[PDB]
Amino acid sequence: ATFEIVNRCSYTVWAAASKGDAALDAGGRQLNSGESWTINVEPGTKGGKIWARTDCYFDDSGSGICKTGDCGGLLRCKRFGRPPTTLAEFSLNQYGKDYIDISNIKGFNVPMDFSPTTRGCRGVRCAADIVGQCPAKLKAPGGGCNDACTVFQTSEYCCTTGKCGPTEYSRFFKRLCPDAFSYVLDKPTTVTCPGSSNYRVTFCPTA
Numbered sequence: 001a002t003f004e005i006v007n008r009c010s011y012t013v014w015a016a017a018s019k020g021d022a023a024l025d026a027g028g029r030q031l032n033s034g035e036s037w038t039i040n041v042e043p044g045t046k047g048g049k050i051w052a053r054t055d056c057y058f059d060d061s062g063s064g065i066c067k068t069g070d071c072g073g074l075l076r077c078k079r080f081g082r083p084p085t086t087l088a089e090f091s092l093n094q095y096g097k098d099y100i101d102i103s104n105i106k107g108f109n110v111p112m113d114f115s116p117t118t119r120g121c122r123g124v125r126c127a128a129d130i131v132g133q134c135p136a137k138l139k140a141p142g143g144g145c146n147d148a149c150t151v152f153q154t155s156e157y158c159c160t161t162g163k164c165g166p167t168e169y170s171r172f173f174k175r176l177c178p179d180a181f182s183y184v185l186d187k188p189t190t191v192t193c194p195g196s197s198n199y200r201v202t203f204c205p206t207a
């Protein structure tokens with residue numbers, strides 16, 4: 001499938017795409033305000049994620065650091081990034097269907113729209129000012145709003161026993177972005193699309 005990744009933010013982001021144990025396409029790229037990056041993701045990919053990273057510094061060998069979403073110091077991500085990271089998540093061609101969602105389970109750094117560019121389903125979006133409204137205990141040192149699991153490392157926030165409920169922190173994310181996962185057992189906001197659809201991920205969709 002084809003994913004177009006568009007930075008509509010007024011600031012530069014460094015996009016990333018990975019399935020956890022491997023890069024998706026090149027794995028990462030600088031996107032200045034307005035730039036688009038088209039990647040190809042192999043059909044059948046399960047557990048793919050796309051995210052933005054902010055305030056990065058890379059040397060000429062693609063090595064460095066980002067204040068949000070860093071994937072072990074690399075420009076071309078092979079692994080997932082450090083929270084906080086708004087997440088576009090997807091699994092393609094699973095029994096004839098694509099599954100997409102946005103998740104705030106690992107916090108939020110940049111607003112995002114995740115939409116098909118082919119027929120047959122709707123997109124999802126989380127574009128509220130989560131960073132502006134972020135509870136004080138969840139604010140990150142480098143911009144962004146962490147999830148409660150990352151900050152407090154409890155069974156209830158991280159849902160480690162597989163039994164857990166919504167929380168005060170959970171409900172904050174859910175209230176600003178009802179279409180995104182707010183905690184591990186949140187009622188799914190997954191969207192089902194036809195197998196082999198194509199997609200656009202837009203950072204800072206409203207502008």
Ligand SMILES: Cc1ccc2c(c1)sc(-c1ccc(N(C)C)cc1)[n+]2C
Pocket residue numbers: 136137138139140141142
């Ligand atoms: C950027 C920024 C701004 C404020 C801010 C943070 C980061 S992190 C933080 C904080 C986090 C945890 C706690 N406790 C668990 C007691 C108390 C305060 N504040 C208040």
